[PDB]
Design a protein around this ligand. Sequence first.
Ligand SMILES: O=P(O)(O)O[C@H]1[C@H](OP(=O)(O)O)[C@@H](OP(=O)(O)O)[C@H](OP(=O)(O)O)[C@@H](OP(=O)(O)O)[C@H]1OP(=O)(O)O
Length: 48
Amino acid sequence: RMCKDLKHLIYYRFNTGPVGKGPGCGFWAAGWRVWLFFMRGITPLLER
RNA sequence: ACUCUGGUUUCUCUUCAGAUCGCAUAAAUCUUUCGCACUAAAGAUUUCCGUGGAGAGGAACAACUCUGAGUCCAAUUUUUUGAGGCCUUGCUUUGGCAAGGCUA
Ligand SMILES: O=P(O)(O)O[C@H]1[C@H](OP(=O)(O)O)[C@@H](OP(=O)(O)O)[C@H](OP(=O)(O)O)[C@@H](OP(=O)(O)O)[C@H]1OP(=O)(O)O
C-alpha cells in the first residue's frame, strides 16, 4: 500500500506541466527503499 | 626568526554506546486494549539492516602546512632624576636613626 502511496506521491508531481498521464515515470528510489526496508526485517526470519 | 612529537588511508579484531547511536526505518515474539487484527493501537523484549567512540593488530605512502611544545622607548604620566647640602630633640647600636624646620 505504501509503494502505491509513493506512486501517488510521485506521479502527481511527475505528471504536471506538459507531462500527462502515461507509463513514462520512473523515479524508483522510494519503492526500492520500501522493499529494502522490508528485506531488512525478514532477512533473519528466512535465515532462521 | 632555529629544534621533537603527533600523521593520512585501508583491512580486521575487541569493548562501550538510550547519542536523530539511523536528519533513515524493518521484522518476529510476548503482554494489554478494544474491535469481531495486513487493512490497529499501546508497552516490552529480541533479531536484523548498519552506525559512532575508544582500545588493539596488520599493510600502504606521506613525513613537519596544521595542533602544540622545546625556543624599534632620554624632554611632564612611571625605566635615563630635583637629585644633593644646613639646624633641634628622643635615643645614640657615638655609625647614626625618626619627626619637623630649612637651603638649593
Ligand atoms: O492509483 P492506482 O489505483 O494504483 O492506478 C494507477 C492510476 O490509474 P487510475 O487513475 O485509473 O486509478 C494512474 O493514473 P493516474 O493516477 O495518473 O490518474 C496510472 O498512472 P498513469 O495513468 O499516469 O500511467 C497507474 O498506472 P502505472 O502505475 O502502471 O503507471 C495506475 O496503476 P495501475 O497499473 O495499477 O493501473
